[PDB]
Amino acid sequence: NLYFQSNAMLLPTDLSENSFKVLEYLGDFKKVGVEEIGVLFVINLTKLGIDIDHYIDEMSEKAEEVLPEVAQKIEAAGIKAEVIKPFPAGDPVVEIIKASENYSFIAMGSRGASKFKKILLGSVSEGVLHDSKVPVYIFKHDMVVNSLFDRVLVAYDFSKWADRALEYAKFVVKKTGGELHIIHVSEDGDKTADLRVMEEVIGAEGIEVHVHIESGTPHKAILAKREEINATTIFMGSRGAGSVMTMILGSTSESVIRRSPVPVFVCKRGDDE
């Protein structure tokens, strides 16, 4: 495959500070092949007591003041920028997913809300993560700019989603010369032997790889590992099962993504999907 190679990247924004964190990593994305970024602002009608055409207009004017700054910063990094127009009005989650059919992946922010606040107030990032078919990359902080793919940690369970997460990971580590780290969590249903074998095969493929077997709650073991080896990003897979509600309440990805100090890339389909 081409992975990030010649990628168009979808960048949703509600103009919030958290939505712009992605922009601190433009150098990292350029170095893996991202060549164009589509910037998507949605007039959020979902929330709606007040007239809903002055609102489209209020919102449109705000975007037009700010988005050119976004476009500017992208151009300055030597990446093509397109402010998507006209601005869709409706549900941000639906409009983002709709638009994403035209892109290789989605890079977006999150306010890092607790499970409770996500449920109470809504979470665009969880909605997107739940239904997206392209990968979704969540950025909250700038702790690892210029180092994004130096130490990639892959949460890996042999599933088709993890498999493709591993392949993206191998791609970036090959591009940037970093280190690949693979963690698999499980009490048993022992797959240690196979994982060890893969460490060896991947080493032979010219990549520096370290495999980690761990016990306990998945999100706990994953974050603990990230700290232990100072991973610069976490790659993982998600089948997006159940409902948004169910994902928020009990998914491994919601917890990992929420408490992670580094960006989390989430693969949303297998190679043969």
Binding site for ligand AMP (CB under 6 A): 12-14, 16, 18-19, 40-42, 44, 92, 108-111, 113, 123-126
CA-to-CA distance for 1 and 140, rounded, in angstroms? Answer: 29
Which one, of 16, 41, 47, lies nearest residue 122 by Cα? 47
196 is in an annotated binding site: no
110 binds Cl ion (CB under 5 A): yes
CA angle, residues 3, 9, 14, in degrees to nearest 5: 150
- Tell whether 60 is in a known binding site: no
- Residue 42 assigned to a binding site: yes
Evaluate whether 67 touches 39 at the Cβ level (below 8 Å). Answer: yes
Pick from 164, 184, 226, 268 the residue near Cl ion by CB under 5 A: 184
Per partner kind, with CB cut-offs from 5 to 8 A, the member of Cl ion, ligand AMP, none near residue 88 is: none
**Could you give the angle at the alpha carbon of 25 between the alpha carbons of 137 and 149, nearest 5°?**
70
- Does 159 appear as a known binding residue? no
Nearest Cα neighbor of 107 from 176, 7, 234, 12 is 12
In the complex, the smallest distance separating the C-beta of residue 233 from ligand AMP, rounded to whole angstroms, is: 18
141 binds Cl ion (CB under 5 A): yes
| 258 versus 268: smaller Cβ distance to Cl ion | 258
Helix or strand holding residue 167 (H, E): helix 160-176
269 is in an annotated binding site: no
Q: Are 156 and 180 in contact (CB under 8 A)?
A: no
Nearest to ligand AMP of 12, 135 (CB atom): 12
State the nearest-atom distance from the C-beta of 40 to ligand AMP, in Å: 6
100 binds, among ligand AMP, Cl ion, none (CB under 5 to 8 A by kind): none
Give the Cα separation of 96 and 75 in Å (integer): 22
Could you tell me if 240 and 104 are in contact, meaning their C-beta atoms sit under 8 angstroms apart? no
Q: How many residues bind Cl ion (CB under 5 A)?
A: 15
**Spatial separation of the C-alpha atoms in residues 133 and 150, rounded to whole Å:** 26
Q: Enter the tokens of residue 244.
A: 């948004």
Nearer to Cl ion, 181 or 219 (CB): 219
Which 3 state secondary structure label does DSSP give 269?
coil
**Of 23 and 144, which has the nearer Cβ to ligand AMP?**
23
179 binds, among ligand AMP, Cl ion, none (CB under 5 to 8 A by kind): none
Supply 57's token pair. Answer: 């207009």
Contact letters for Cl ion, residues 226-265 (x by CB under 5 A): --------------------------x----xx----x--
Is 238 labeled as ligand-binding? Answer: no
| 111 binding partner (options Cl ion, ligand AMP, none; Cβ < 5 to 8 Å by kind) | ligand AMP
Question: Is residue 60 within a helix (H) or strand (E), and if so which, with residue range?
Answer: helix 54-76
Binding positions for AMP: 12, 18, 42, 109, 111, 123-125
Binding-site ranges for Cl ion (CB under 5 A): 110, 112, 139-141, 155, 157, 184-185, 218-219, 252, 257-258, 263
